[PDB]
Amino acid sequence: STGSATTTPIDSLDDAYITPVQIGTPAQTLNLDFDTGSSDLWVFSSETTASEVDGQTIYTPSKSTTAKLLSGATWSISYGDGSSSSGDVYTDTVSVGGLTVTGQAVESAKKVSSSFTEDSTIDGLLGLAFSTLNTVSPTQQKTFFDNAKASLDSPVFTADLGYHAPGTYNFGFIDTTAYTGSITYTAVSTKQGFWEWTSTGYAVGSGTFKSTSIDGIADTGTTLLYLPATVVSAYWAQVSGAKSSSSVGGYVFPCSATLPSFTFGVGSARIVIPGDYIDFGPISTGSSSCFGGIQSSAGIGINIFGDVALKAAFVVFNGATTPTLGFASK
Template sequence: MKFSSWSAAVTASLLSLSSGALAAAIEKSKGPTATQNFELTKEMLEISVFGGQTIHAPQVVNSGFVTTTGRGPRALAKAYAKFGVEISPELLLILEEILEALGITVPGTTGTGSTSGTGGTNANQTTSASQGMVAAVPQLFDTEYLAQVSIGTPPQTLMLDFDTGSSDLWVFSTETPKTQENGQTLYNIAASSTAKQLEGATWSITYGDGSSSSGDVYLDTVSIGGVTVTNQAVESARKVSSSFTNDTASSGLLGLAMNSINQVQPTPQKTFFSNALDNLAMPLFTANLKKEEAGNYNFGFIDTTEFEGSISFINANTTQGFWQFESAGFAVGNSSTTTITSVPHQAIADTGTTLLMLPTAIVEAYYAQVQSAQLSQEFGGYVFNCNEDLPNLTLAIGSYNAVVPGGLINFAPADDISPTGSSTICFGGLQASSGLPFAIYGDVFLKSQFVVFHGGNAQLGFAPKPTTS
């Protein structure tokens, strides 16, 4: 049996179950309830059959995103914009000050605030390999994770933001106006022999700050880490908001939520994951995001070296198009025996949102245990002294308790509007979800967990990371 050019140790950990093994283990009709999860142990994942090549996409360093200024308020505004929540005048003023410090000019700015710094997003097949792996690359303070995606024939490599909170694959292209480009790698439509326009199809995404991106649609070959889909809908940007123009490191976005929220009209298109699903060795992908270093997404297999203990599965509610689930409550502190306080809430697992955004009751209870914490109008959210030793936050997801280390909640310097200044105040990675339709378990949470997105059973799986990571 031949494997790709990995070390034998890593290859041995990439698992593909025999036909029906995982499905039998977590059969939907016998699956977890809202309060009791199904536990999948490593012993259930013994190798039966390797379903094809195992491919590891090399990590890529993004040197174009090095600015620390205003990371916290920008991440907060990004979440609001993504889900259509009005951005407060106070936060708009903060953003305008940040943009001014960054030297970013916003057309039409009148001095009442700008939202161009929000980074608001979101926004047939053959499989050359049944397994694939793609490295996620963090930008400073993990605000955005990018990964290599190949589009067209011959392949053109673009760096895209993988987003489990949206369902569009859209890119900067040769159709994007020159005035709206800023060094992004472009999808050259004419250079791809397999590109064909989807006649009559258009897309348009409007963000919470009133800006929008839009364009037309092509069908082309798309590959991620060796998994290839033909006739994948690729949305070509004929217009992009200035927030995307200013993000020079990213050439677009690849959505991994449900097909139902795809924005192509008149007929919504399938996501890359949905198109590839039937040909994957296992109908799932996993996210292993990390703090201040590259993580990875695996498609079609589970790597047992990336988690400890068992994977705890809970049913996902996909009716609204997201990887939505119910969380039961929380605990604050570093004790493993801390009692869970009941605060039931609906949440989504969203790699496209940087922060962890929870009900106000949880956020207030957490920061009540942080002596220097305060809700700051000046900075747009909760801040605290950078040298504060933050407690852990435990979130109860069914019968599984997910622990978010306090170190992850120290997100970024806050008092850094001047790029040459020093910081003593830090912005919290945990903020309130007030105004949002659900809590958002974004990257601050996801970096603490190994997460399985099971498309076959519409389930989410969570497991602790190895203590050495």
């Protein structure tokens, strides 16, 4: 079997991407943020603290004939940006673009942090990292991808994120019409539960390619590109007026500047991020200082190939027994 669903940016900056997901019987359609950096499927629900819901669509397990409370199970998660949420667990039928999984753990949020409440367009998250990161206690639960793996034609899913445009998540097959050239596959380490790979280097604009190993994670749930300080300083040194701002919390640049592209290495292949992808607009309404899409990972502890990098490529998440990551130009 296979599945295919359209993913849509939530705003004009591509801050996140939402994908419609059917939960329950009859179907309750929620727009979820597909997050390859986490492994919990959690949703706003009828159980969420009422003051913490502001425009989201909520899952109502009491109206689903297939919903079963997972007795005694709780969950609590904290994301690298300080966001958090917690609640209890149900099992229910979950379908993505025609691909159906019965008995999927659907984690009902009782408490959500402020950043989720203020994001009215995101009804929840669908984690696509490895199941070892799932926070359900005392019985860890599998991800949607892990539960569907056996019935998929091929144990893969692909991410084709659009630049200011809709994109596609595909489960079970590689669309050979969606990319140009060949797919370059690179080895993945699962030791931390992430889609963790090693980039072979980088280049700034038309500059010389620097062969150097950059260890990082493919994370659709992270907006920006987070790279080591040496690399990020080398990029922003090529933008006139660019500087690191402690008050803003990152590199900013004059909104009138033109940004160079950024190239990162996948094996012997190259993925080029257009400079326009690195522009995230004014730091405040009316400001002439603009926020950069490439930031330092020094404070994070891990390099993150977020949406800024991934939307420049066709990306294959190969969940075979030896998992691999595939990158193609598009």
